[PDB]
Structure 1
Amino acid sequence: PRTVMVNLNIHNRNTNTNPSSDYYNRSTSPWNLHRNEDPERYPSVIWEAKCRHLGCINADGNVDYHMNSVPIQQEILVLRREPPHSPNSFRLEKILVSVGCTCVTPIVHHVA
């Protein structure tokens, strides 16, 4: 079906199975989260990661410029109000959200 009903009273499911950890701070590719708010969307607030460094942190605690911190982006669906400002009708939309960062070897190639 094109149109369906959704009950917005969320039930949690296994959110206390493999659940504070401070990975964003302990990572060799650390990041910070920034708040994105849009009143025309559910969820209205989405937190986005931004990597703190271009490089990665090494064993000595210094930045290793030979490796790159990169954000891990995830395709996410959101509900957008349709028509605009509607309290109770939406369309699904697809966006990319950065969830955190990892450290990768760069892709290397001579200029052509």
Structure 2
Amino acid sequence: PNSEDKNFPRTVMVNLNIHKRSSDYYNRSTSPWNLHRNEDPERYPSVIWEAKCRHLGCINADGNVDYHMNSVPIQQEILVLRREPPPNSFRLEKILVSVGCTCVTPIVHHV
């Protein structure tokens, strides 16, 4: 429990300027991902939709999954506010959630 800023070089106070499309690529993409409800009762955002690339390949136009070209998740470090000590107090994190799933041509070595 804290109320003011004192005797702490990195305890800061925050304010309010936190600031309907792009919601169908989970299937419409060539490398679909299934959102996983990584829900933490003390972490904002309370829900993060991690991308678990559903198929290792990429689905071509015919709908049959092709093994000629693979898909890799795009993770990204984000800052989240986990409560501590469990008022309104928080502490940052650098967690490597996965946002999307971009599908790539494989690296080919000839002979």
- TM-score bracket, shorter-length normalisation: 0.7 to 0.9
Residue in 2 that maps onto 1:89: 89
Distance 2:28 2:20 in 1: 28
Are residues 1:6 and 2:14 paired?
yes
Distance 2:16 2:108 in 1: 47
Identity of aligned residues (%): 99
Q: CA RMSD in A?
A: 3.2
1:4-33 deviation digits (Å, cap 9, x = unpaired): 1123673399xxxxxx55222111111121
Distance 1:71 1:62 in 2: 21
Residue in 1 that maps onto 2:52: 50
In the TM superposition, residue 49 of structure 1 has moved relative to its aligned partner by: 1.4
1:36-67 deviation digits (Å, cap 9, x = unpaired): 11112122221211111011112322111121
SS of equivalent to 1:10: coil
Distance 1:52 1:89 in 2: 37
SS of equivalent to 2:26: helix
> What is the number of equivalent residue pairs in this alignment?
103
Taking a change above 3 Å as real, the CA distance of residues 63 and 12 of structure 1, as seen in their structure-2 partners, is: closer
Q: Which is greater in Rg? A: 2
